[PDB]
């Protein structure tokens, strides 16, 4: 110990500046710290979880506070489609007078930023109506962040810290998460919708003062205990209904209409309340599967032991997988990040196609910002899922306790998995690029008719299968005779078919050959990013080049210039290489989404359908064309409110290019340069009276890869966020 970092003696005894960097970069790697035990490991993780929850509650609390203080929420409720919501107020003493003038918008007294997170529509749809309601929620979350820190501190003293056996109680944890954390929370949310949100959506302001007096339904509760639940679905709202008023209001609380509210263009609030209630009670029954202290339930160990196919095509099946995952926190985090990244992308794909918050589909800047945000979030989460999968193989995988099960068999034929992932990436890359270049050459020579435009007929057939008419393939939901259509005409199909064939929303947009080419670029990005992460995770314990890689850990610089050269041979470097492909993949995904919508919102879908089939169209008719108002955020003749993006736009270009220095130039050059600088300081008068207490050295090789990747990613995200919002909000459509 003796000095920073107190958890690593070898870092503390470093005489150079490297002591500080590695002390920061390894603060949360509890397993590498000195004198760590399984108890201290789970306990520090437990308290870190509480601290995170406190962070999240405090963050949401602050968001409510500024919307209620400097925001537009009360004025925005009156005009949902004519009021620009306010994020907070701007107080920058570097502002010139015109900067104050151009940034004063949304109907405020001083300069303000226009919020683009969608919390206004979210809070209006759930029942919040006045700034006082937002102040109440902020105090509650500030108080919740307080008790989160309280519980985190509480379980760090003896007799409150639990044993590692308590953390390894998987059966009880799953039952409670499915029953309580998943189901009871969804059940209570359905309760909030049917008490406050739905009546709030009909003109009735239900709050804590009067929620005990009002009835959510005229004949409340009674039918629920009888079985005549259909009385809760009798009188929905008319298709000619105004959200904050009562003209067209009904009295139903649980419906299955299937479409959108025609005015708000968001999902039916009764449908959402019924949805949460149905999935909740489904989670409640499902949360009674595993065995606890009552003599009934399953042993997850025994279920895994019993799933072994005779004939031995999977060897010993899943035997030993229970303890393999229950003892490895990296395995559990890998599964958690994998599932979370999938449902994060699921949220992205559904919030733009099935908007659930009132008056959010018309806020085009908000829809673009939200989809881009979650897709990059999900991309990072997926890279982390595979990163911790490799970390599990190195730090926790016991080959003898996983003998001849499915997990060890993955390693047994690692070459087959990696080679075929390589073939699929090569196939997709060769052909997708080739077709794009072919069409580029055709349009260069002025012969558009010679392009190769393949019709995405399989996804078109699926859209017709959902009842879309634009392609006329006459399958179920699109054909009058299929039983899939007859069984649903009574319920969701009227509203569903009404919404899918509306040419304004984005519920299953019309797709053409341009969409076929972009989706194959997406397949290339997914396959190659998967290839990088899987090859690194399977070759993490060893390779023909370095058969003892597991002894060197997860993150090390290299193995030297011997044996031909072993640069970027660790699994950490595999992650580091895959993040570039993740950013490239999400870049393709979001370039696709933003261009299709920004042409749809402009009513010019033909420009996308005709220009997305060749890459010169992407450079010219998407990036170059939409950058106009952005780059003119400030010109030699003045500026407007888009200047903050024109600046951030260039800011992102700088950080990104700065990362190239850390990624192209490597260490030894900078070490010799620092040596020539240390001599300069020791031989300079006056200044040599100042002595450094940490020896200046060049950044570590792994540190350089990390710093270069962080600059690359920060520039990536900030450059695109600036262009996205400025090109969309500059038009607002």
């Amino acid at each position: 110990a003796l000095r920073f970092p107190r958890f690593s003696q070898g870092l503390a005894q470093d005489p150079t500046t490297r002591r500080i960097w590695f002390g920061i970069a390894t603060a949360h790697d509890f397993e590498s710290h000195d004198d760590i035990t399984e108890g201290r490991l789970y306990q520090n993780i437990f308290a870190s979880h509480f601290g995170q929850l406190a962070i999240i509650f405090l963050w949401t609390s602050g968001n409510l506070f500024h919307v209620a203080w400097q925001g537009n929420f009360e004025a925005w409720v009156q005009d949902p489609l004519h009021v620009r919501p306010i994020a907070h107020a701007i107080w920058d003493p570097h502002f010139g007078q015109p900067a104050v003038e151009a940034f004063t918008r949304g109907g405020a007294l001083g300069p303000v930023n226009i919020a683009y997170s969608g919390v206004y529509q979210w809070w209006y749809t759930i029942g919040l109506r006045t700034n006082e309601d937002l102040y109440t929620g902020a105090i509650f979350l500030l108080f919740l962040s307080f008790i989160s820190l309280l519980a985190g501190w509480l379980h760090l003293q003896p007799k409150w810290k639990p044993s590692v056996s308590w953390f390894k109680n998987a059966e009880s944890r799953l039952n409670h998460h499915l029953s309580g954390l998943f189901g009871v929370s969804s059940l209570a949310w359905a309760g909030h919708l049917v008490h406050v949100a739905i009546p709030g959506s009909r003109g009735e302001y239900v709050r804590w003062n009067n929620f005990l007096s009002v009835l959510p339904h005229p004949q409340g509760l009674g039918p629920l205990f009888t079985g005549q639940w259909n009385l809760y679905a009798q009188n929905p709202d008319s298709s000619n209904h105004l959200f904050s008023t009562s003209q067209g209001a009904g009295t139903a609380i649980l419906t299955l209409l299937g479409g959108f509210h025609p005015q708000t263009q968001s999902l039916w609030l009764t449908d959402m309340a019924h949805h949460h209630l149905a999935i909740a009670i489904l989670f409640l029954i499902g949360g009674h599967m595993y065995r606890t202290n009552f003599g009934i339930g399953h042993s997850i160990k025994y279920i895994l032991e019993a799933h072994i196919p005779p004939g031995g095509r999977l060897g010993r099946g899943h035997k030993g997988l229970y303890d393999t995952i229950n003892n490895s926190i990296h395995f559990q985090l890998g599964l958690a990040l994998a599932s979370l990244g999938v449902i994060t992308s699921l949220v992205a794909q559904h919030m733009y196609s099935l908007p659930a918050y009132a008056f959010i589909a018309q806020d085009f800047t908000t829809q673009a910002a939200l989809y881009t945000h979650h897709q990059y979030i999900a991309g990072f989460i997926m890279t982390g899922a595979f990163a911790h999968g490799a970390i599990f193989f190195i730090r926790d995988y016991n080959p003898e306790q996983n003998a001849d099960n499915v997990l060890a068999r993955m390693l047994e034929h690692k070459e087959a998995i990696i080679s075929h992932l390589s073939w699929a990436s090569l196939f997709l890359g060769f052909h997708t690029l080739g077709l794009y270049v072919h069409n580029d050459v055709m349009l260069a020579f002025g012969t558009p008719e010679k392009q190769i435009l393949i019709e995405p007929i399989f996804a078109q057939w699926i859209q017709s299968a959902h009842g879309k008419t634009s392609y006329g393939f006459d399958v179920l939901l699109s054909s009058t005779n299929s039983p899939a259509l007859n069984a649903g005409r009574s319920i969701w199909l009227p509203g569903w078919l009404n919404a899918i064939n509306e040419n304004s929303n984005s519920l299953f947009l019309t797709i053409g050959p341009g969409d076929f080419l972009v989706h194959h670029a997406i397949a290339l990005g997914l396959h190659t990013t998967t290839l990088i992460l899987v090859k690194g995770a399977l070759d993490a314990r060893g390779s023909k080049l370095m058969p003892d890689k597991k002894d060197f850990g997860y993150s090390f610089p290299c193995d030297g210039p011997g044996r031909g050269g072993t640069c970027d041979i660790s699994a950490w470097d595999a992650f580091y290489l895959a993040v570039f492909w993740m950013l490239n993949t999400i870049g393709w995904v979001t370039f696709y989404w933003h261009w299709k919508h920004i042409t749809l919102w402009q009513g010019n879908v033909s420009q996308f359908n005709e220009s997305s089939t060749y890459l010169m169209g992407w450079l010219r008719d998407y990036l170059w064309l939409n950058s106009s108002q952005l780059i003119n955020g400030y010109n030699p003749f003045g500026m407007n409110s888009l200047s903050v993006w024109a600046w951030m736009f260039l800011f992102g270009h700088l950080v990104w290019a700065t990362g190239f220095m850390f990624l192209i130039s490597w260490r030894g050059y900078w070490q010799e340069l620092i040596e020539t600088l240390a001599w300069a300081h020791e031989r300079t008068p006056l200044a040599n009276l100042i002595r450094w207490r940490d020896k200046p050295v060049a950044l570590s090789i792994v540190q350089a890869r990390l710093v270069g990747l962080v600059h690359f990613s920060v520039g990536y995200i900030f450059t695109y966020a600036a262009f996205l919002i400025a090109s969309t909000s500059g038009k607002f459509g």
Binding site: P15, D548, A678, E682
Partner: protein
């Protein structure tokens, strides 16, 4: 300082000791191989981690292994 280890697969060709630029390796008598000698790392406090010894080992797999550990003034190659 960096850790250096010698495994008994060593054939005793004395190549790791010749390539070492800070005199960390030694050749001690042994009875396992034909040259009657094996390598040892008694002065890893001077080891810089160049892995120039591993580049010269003819054994498959290596018989010298340099596991980069806690950095010191000597291991970082500082003249200042």
């Amino acid at each position: 300082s960096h850790s250096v280890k010698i495994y008994d697969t060593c054939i005793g060709c004395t190549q790791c000791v010749r390539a070492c630029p800070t005199d960390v390796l030694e050749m001690i008598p042994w009875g396992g191989c034909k040259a009657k000698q094996i390598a040892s790392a008694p002065r890893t406090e001077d080891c810089v981690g160049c892995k120039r010894c591993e580049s010269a080992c003819p054994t498959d797999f290596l018989s010298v292994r340099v596991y980069l550990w806690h950095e010191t003034t000597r291991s970082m190659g500082l003249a200042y």
